[PDB]
Design a protein around this ligand. Structure first.
Ligand code: BTN
Ligand code: BTN
Lengths: 235, 235
């Protein structure tokens, strides 16, 4: 009934009134590339850094099965596909979404969406949680709160899937193109604190050709942060 | 993100841009009760009389997985649940559909929908094909042709799933109720011909408690037509 016109992402869509986690279902089940798993609510939503993700009714909670298997080097860029897709959709609704390296989208420094990519071999699961009309925790915001009015959840879904399909098809061809899009939509030029094995502060200058965050410490030392067990905090 | 509020039918929905047959997929895949399989188009759609069923873009092509298992002979009643559900949905859109025993819905004697039930395995698959905005064969009709305007396919889907869930939940408790609903919406009191071996003609009087079509031949003989391979023609 949906009439999706995408090439890969959205070939099939599995909808649930309720699910434990779309990412877990997608990782576990035998699914074709491009299949989207979406649920009205998640009872056990998962975030990055082993944090839980509140997923009440009203938000967009989905996961997409991908099997890019490009050069091992240009693979860790899948997270950016999700973040950029969300930013483009937000702009379509006139909301100023900006990317917080490596996987968050903020509006006025408040979290409106998060991306969780999980991969085991050939299969890559791209999870995206976007606050639309749902209530949110402190430190977060939603499309409804930003616009001051309810937004048709299905319209957001259609827009996002369309953007993601386009970004993904181009990523298979030109893997580095996404980096330019991230750079143009990422919060940079401000001081940040990097939390990992210890911590350090500096100016988030840009992302390099591998998607690493480039930080300039006050001493002038340049650090390159790799996506992984590391978090970013704005000062 | 569809936000369905049904109890059983529609707890999960699997959408396909293209599929061979929603009934075939439902039969050969492990799916929980209430799962709805829907596709924009079918490349190998089929009907009751082991015939082909045109399933172009624009129509509503779906299958529902059921596992009622009421006393075992309220089986032909499942087909009736599908037919009545369609009739109720059509009424919501200002269209008067009537049932042609045992699985077709006609509008002014032109076919607008067909129901195909298959109990293969121990699961029962309820398939429904409804002409909405798609081109239709000569002699048939569609919601678009009846209303003179395009009808939002998802609105039809939501309406039908809602009606079917209600009808099914009641069927599980009061299996006999569907019979009077069928009788009140079925084409009766007209002459028909039963094709095939031992063909005969008569007046279609009503359906009995087993869902059999009761025919009064001109001789006064009363025959009971069982639901299955049977082919009926209006005279
Ligand atoms: O910002 C983060 O830390 C990532 C959050 C990712 C949330 C989404 S909701 C859809 C998918 N299913 C999950 O359990 N998590 C992701
Ligand atoms: O009128 C008939 O003889 C029954 C037609 C049933 C058509 C539907 S379309 C959804 C489902 N998938 C199929 O292949 N057939 C049924």
């Amino acid at each position: 009934m949906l009439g999706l016109k995408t090439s890969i992402i959205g070939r099939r869509v599995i909808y649930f009134q309720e699910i434990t986690s779309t990412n877990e279902f997608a990782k576990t089940s035998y699914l074709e590339e491009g299949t989207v798993i979406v649920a009205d609510k998640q009872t056990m939503g998962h975030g990055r850094l082993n944090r839980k993700w509140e997923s009440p009714e009203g938000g967009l909670w989905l996961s997409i099965v991908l099997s890019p298997k490009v050069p091992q080097k240009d693979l860790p860029k899948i997270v950016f596909l999700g973040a950029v897709g969300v930013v483009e959709t937000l702009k379509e609704f006139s909301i100023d979404g900006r990317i917080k390296w490596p996987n968050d989208v903020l509006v006025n420094y408040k979290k409106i969406a998060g991306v969780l990519v999980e991969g085991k071999g050939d299969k890559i699961v791209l999870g995206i949680g976007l606050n639309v009309n749902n209530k949110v925790p402190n430190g977060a915001t939603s499309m409804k709160l930003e616009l001051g009015s309810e937004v048709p959840l299905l319209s957001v879904f259609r827009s996002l899937i369309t953007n993601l399909d386009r970004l993904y098809l181009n990523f298979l061809k030109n893997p580095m193109d996404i980096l330019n899009l991230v750079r143009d939509n990422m919060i940079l030029g401000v001081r940040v604190k990097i939390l990992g094995d210890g911590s350090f502060e500096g100016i988030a200058e840009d992302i390099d050709d591998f998607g690493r965050l480039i930080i300039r410490l006050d001493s002038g030392e340049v650090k390159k942060v790799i996506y992984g067990d590391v978090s970013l905090r704005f000062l």
